[PDB]
Design a protein around this ligand. Structure first.
Ligand code: E2K
Length: 342
């Protein structure tokens, strides 16, 4: 078996000529030559079976990506694993090889307004499909947006996804931990479990702001600092928006703060397209019930050159693990991956 950087990467004989790419959320990522399709691909090594939580995330990722089929969502081309559960220690997921991701791109490249518009359109087109399946991604951020050499954009990593459950979204103050901090909506810290589609729209708004300036708009230094940054730009919430928060601890925290004025978007982004800033404002709206939804965002004037609802498909079959032991989850992963055996 081929090895990479002193570690088994057991993918042959179909996949050869391996090169290290990096260390992702699940393990080592390499490129490899696909001797059948005669193209180089990405291969991700996953070793989850010692821990129930790792098995949960791996099953979510595989189950969702196998059921979705969309141009703006990364597909699974192949899955490599041992022929029996007893011999299965690792799982390798094979995907199209993508030149870069939006995190790496923003480290060194200024985006044209035309690229910002195109990237945002593709993110929302993919998200429309995800939401139409009753699924929440719950970890949208630049490093989960892959790009190939012609700037085709694909959303990746569904290991933190959930089925939407808006009727059970309310919770208490300072208890919830959903999404990566900088992309986390204000209500997560106030009264929300992150079970509604508006959590994803907030993250897309954060990504849009970051595309406009190459810096994160709300760079909280730790969990508690994140709300300080959000309110420092949005300003104090209105009485109407506070009246929508029934939880007293959350509401009284906001009432205890000194008044803060809104910072106008065009002062933060003086070279931005004014239509982009109008859409940005609607995605970064404090009240999640007033926040724009994905189909409204696609129809916004900023995206008029691309908008075409008949070419913005939805899922055929929406989705309608907490307590399973890792042994049952391993068996489920084994069954989910059987179609690729051979
Ligand atoms: N940081 N880091 N290490 C991982 C390194 O892998 C890269 N990469 C990922 S991983 C995507 C996010 C979720 C995960 O972490 O699994 N998929 C890729 C793919 N299809 N094609 C090419 N490269 C990929 C990623 O662009 C980075 O260069």
């Amino acid at each position: 078996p081929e090895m990479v950087r002193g570690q088994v990467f057991d993918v042959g004989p179909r996949y050869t000529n391996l090169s290290y790419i990096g260390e992702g959320a699940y393990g080592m990522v390499c490129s490899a030559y696909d001797n059948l399709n005669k193209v180089r691909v990405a291969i991700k090594k996953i070793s989850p079976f010692e821990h129930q939580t790792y098995c949960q995330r791996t099953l979510r990722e595989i189950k969702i990506l196998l059921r979705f089929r969309h141009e703006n969502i990364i597909g699974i081309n192949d899955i490599i694993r041992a022929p029996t559960i007893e011999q299965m220690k690792d799982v390798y997921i094979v995907q199209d090889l993508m030149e870069t991701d939006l995190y790496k791109l923003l480290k060194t490249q200024h985006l044209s307004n035309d690229h910002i518009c195109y990237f945002l359109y593709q993110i929302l087109r993919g998200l429309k499909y995800i939401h139409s399946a009753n699924v929440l991604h719950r970890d949208l951020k630049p490093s989960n947006l892959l790009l190939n050499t012609t700037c085709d954009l694909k959303i990746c990593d569904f290991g933190l996804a959930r089925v939407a459950d808006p009727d059970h979204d309310h919770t208490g103050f300072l208890t919830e931990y959903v999404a990566t901090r900088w992309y986390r909506a204000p209500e997560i810290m106030l009264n929300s479990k992150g079970y509604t589609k508006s959590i994803d729209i907030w993250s897309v708004g954060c990504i849009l702001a970051e595309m406009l300036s190459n810096r994160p708009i709300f760079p909280g230094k730790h969990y508690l600092d994140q709300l300080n940054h959000i309110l420092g730009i949005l300003g104090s919430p209105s009485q109407e928006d506070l009246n929508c928060i029934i939880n007293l601890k959350a509401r009284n925290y906001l009432l205890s703060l000194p008044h803060k004025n809104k910072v106008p978007w065009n002062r933060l982004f003086p070279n931005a397209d004014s239509k982009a800033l109008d859409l940005l404002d609607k995605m970064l709206t404090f009240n999640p019930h007033k926040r724009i939804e994905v189909e409204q965002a696609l129809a916004h004037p900023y995206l008029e050159q691309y908008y075409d609802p008949s070419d913005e498909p939805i899922a055929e079959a929406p989705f309608k693990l907490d307590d399973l032991p890792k042994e049952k989850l391993k068996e489920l992963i084994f069954e989910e991956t059987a179609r690729f055996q051979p």
